[PDB]
Structures are given as structure tokens and as C-alpha cells.
Design a protein around this ligand. Structure first.
Ligand SMILES: CNc1nc(Nc2ccc(C(=O)N3CCOCC3)cc2OC)nc2[nH]cc(Cl)c12
Ligand SMILES: [Cl-]
Ligand code: NA
Length: 261
């Protein structure tokens, strides 16, 4: 299987709609990633957002080709695979590696927000790694514009992944985009530091979430996390989105700025 000059050589991942393949150019040996979609107002938006992206912690879009019912979206390859696969279950990863990834994730998210794009599904499966283990935010199939001509639009559509999703998204008819992405970054931070997700969803009927709101940090996963990163998580995973820490203030946090191995 192939497309114009590229061979499709290995399945890198399966998706709801699609598949991502390792594409290797027959002549040049360049290797890229190609997302293959069967059957497009949506993918029209997606491609449009994809052509905006230019930042070292965001997956680069190379171009696309339509061949019948199939669209081929060519993108930078992340040959390190996903962050998901660097997280040891029940353990996490070393704190200095978690911090570095968190810095890189912030740099990507600030970039996105700066161009008025929200990603809306930040989680370790969507955070890929290049050959030097530089983090790249991938998959813009749920991404959308929240700021345009310097005017913010609130969101109303429910989407994302329940364990990463902010509580306002389940309780409010409309909500601001930025604090939803900040929240998912805090759940990613927890996963990195504890190798476990704290709750099934941030709802009033989920006991693990009530436990957090009651500050029972002698329970897992919090008891596995050092007090400095945990103090940051206390400012990110705040139920009311107007009281939640913003990225400019994350950048002032004591753990964020702590030198580590
Ligand atoms: C899954 N999506 C993607 N995947 C990749 N790369 C890779 C992802 C996973 C692996 C990986 O460990 N494997 C082991 C298990 O069998 C599959 C490959 C390797 C990758 O590269 C060589 N690069 C992308 N760039 C944009 C998207 Cl979107 C994307
Ligand atoms: Cl996890
Ligand atoms: Na698991």
C-alpha cells in the first residue's frame, strides 16, 4: 500500500475514524506520519487548524491528498511514540522527566491558546515524543477556535476523555476553553507522577473526586506525590474555573521552577 511517492509501511495507531501509518518515501527515505481517514466538513476544519500550527511542541502539518473516499494527512513523525508508554503503571516516572515533559506541554498549550486554538483532548495518548524525547501535542480532530478577531467565544460542546475532562464541562451550558485545557494538563501531571488516574470523572457522584475536594491526600494517587508538585496540583485541579490557576501563574509555581536531575 502506498500513496503517490510514499509507501505505507507500519501501523502506528488506530483511531475512531482512521489509522495512522508510518510513511517512507521510496526515493529519499524520509519518514513521516500519515493519518488516513475514510470519507468532511469536519476534516475541512481540522486541515484548516493543522495549517496554522508552527511550534516545536506541536505536531507539524506537511500537507494532504484526497484519493476517492480517503484523505491522507501528512505530519511530522514522532518516532519516540507516546507519553502514555513512558508512564509505568502505579509508579509514574522520575520527577525530573515529568517536569521536563510538563514544561514542554505548557509551552505547546500556550502556543495554541496564543493562536486562539483549544485542543480539547489533552492526555498522554495525544502527547508524542520525537527522537530526542521532545514532547509534541498531536491530534487536532477535536480542536476548535475559541478566540477570533480578539473576541473570545465560549464553548458548549461536550468532548474529550472523561478522566481528563474538567468538571465545568459536565455542569455548565457554556464554559471558557482555556481552563479546560489547563485542567487536563493537571491530570496528565498526576498520571506522570503516580502512574494512576485520580478519578473516573470529576462529578459529584464520583467518590474519588469528593475525596480530593475534601483534601484527603493520604489516599492514592496523591500520597505518592511529593509535596511540591502536589501543591501545584492543588492549584490546577480547582473545581471553579475562574478560581483555577492560569498558565502565567503556573509559570511562577515553586515546583515548576525547581531545579531537578
Ligand atoms: C499514533 N500517532 C502518531 N504516531 C507517531 N509515531 C509513532 C507512534 C508510536 C510508535 C510506537 O511506539 N509503536 C510501537 C507499537 O506499534 C506501533 C508503533 C512509533 C511511532 O513512530 C515510529 N507519529 C505521529 N505523528 C503524528 C501522529 Cl498523529 C503520530
Ligand atoms: Cl495513566
Ligand atoms: Na492501565
Amino acid at each position: 500500500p502506498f500513496v503517490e511517492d510514499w509507501d505505507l509501511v507500519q501501523t502506528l495507531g488506530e483511531g475512531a475514524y482512521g489509522e495512522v501509518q508510518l510513511a517512507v518515501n521510496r526515493v529519499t527515505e524520509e519518514a513521516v506520519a500519515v493519518k488516513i481517514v475514510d470519507m468532511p466538513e469536519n476534516i475541512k476544519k481540522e486541515i484548516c487548524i493543522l495549517k496554522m500550527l508552527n511550534h516545536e511542541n506541536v505536531i507539524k502539518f506537511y500537507g494532504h491528498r484526497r484519493e476517492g473516499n480517503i484523505q491522507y494527512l501528512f505530519m511530522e513523525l514522532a518516532s519516540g511514540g507516546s507519553l502514555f508508554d513512558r508512564i509505568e503503571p502505579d509508579i509514574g516516572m522520575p520527577e525530573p522527566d515529568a517536569q521536563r515533559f510538563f514544561h514542554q506541554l505548557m509551552a505547546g498549550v500556550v502556543y495554541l491558546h496564543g493562536i486562539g486554538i483549544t485542543h480539547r483532548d489533552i492526555k498522554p495518548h495525544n502527547l508524542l515524543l520525537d527522537e530526542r524525547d521532545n514532547l509534541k501535542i498531536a491530534d487536532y480532530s477535536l480542536a476548535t477556535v475559541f478566540r477570533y478577531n480578539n473576541r473570545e467565544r465560549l464553548l458548549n460542546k461536550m468532548c474529550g476523555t472523561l478522566p481528563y475532562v474538567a468538571p465545568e464541562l459536565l455542569k455548565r451550558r457554556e464554559f471558557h476553553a482555556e481552563p479546560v485545557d489547563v485542567w487536563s494538563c493537571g491530570i496528565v501531571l498526576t498520571a506522570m507522577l503516580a502512574g494512576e488516574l485520580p478519578w473516573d470523572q470529576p462529578s459529584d457522584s464520583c467518590q474519588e473526586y469528593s475525596d480530593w475536594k475534601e483534601k484527603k491526600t493520604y489516599l492514592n494517587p496523591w500520597k505518592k506525590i511529593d509535596s511540591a508538585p502536589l501543591a501545584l496540583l492543588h492549584k490546577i485541579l480547582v473545581e471553579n474555573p475562574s478560581a483555577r490557576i492560569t498558565i502565567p501563574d503556573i509559570k511562577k509555581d515553586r515546583w515548576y521552577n525547581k531545579p531537578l536531575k
